[PDB]
Design a protein around this ligand. Structure first.
Ligand SMILES: Cc1cccc(-n2nc(C(=O)O)cc2-c2ccccc2)c1
Ligand SMILES: O=C(O)c1ccc(-c2ccc(F)c(Cl)c2)o1
Length: 123
């Protein structure tokens, strides 16, 4: 409906990256999904997600969720609620947000556009 950005958990990206709070169940929009280079492993997917204010490209799907992508319920423009995630920090200091459980609240076809004008989150 009207006020589309009101559908998304504005500020959740900053909260995840600044406070590391994991009890939240934020509602985010998928902007894009792509495989990352794997060799002899199951494929792994990276997501560019939006909370309406920011985008963040450091989301990775737990492999148990791969069927959501491969059967196309999880795709660009869909709106989803994250029910379980963890943050991991690499040796170089970069953080990755691993999505363990999520629910698609609105299909890509039912949303159809990038909501709002989110800007990339900086570190
Ligand atoms: C920081 C971050 C967040 C999400 C995905 C990535 N990422 N993207 C690619 C790729 O192939 O593009 C590879 C990685 C990667 C992730 C973890 C460890 C090593 C490499 C990196
Ligand atoms: O269940 C899964 O697939 C899973 C659990 C944890 C990770 C993971 C993925 C990428 C990473 F970089 C790091 Cl540190 C962890 O993946």
């Amino acid at each position: 409906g009207s006020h589309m950005v009101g559908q998304l958990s504005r500020g959740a990206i900053a909260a995840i990256m600044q406070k590391g709070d994991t009890n939240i169940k934020p509602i985010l929009q998928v902007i894009n999904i792509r495989p990352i280079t794997t060799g002899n492993s199951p494929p792994r997917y990276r997501l560019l997600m939006s909370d309406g204010l920011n985008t963040l490209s450091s989301f990775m799907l737990a492999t148990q969720l791969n069927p959501l992508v491969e059967e196309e319920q999880l795709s660009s423009n869909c709106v989803c609620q994250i029910h379980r995630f963890i943050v991991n920090t690499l040796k170089d200091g970069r953080r990755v947000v691993i999505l363990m459980e999520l629910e698609v609240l609105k299909s890509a076809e039912a949303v159809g556009v990038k909501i709002g004008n989110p800007v990339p989150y900086n570190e």
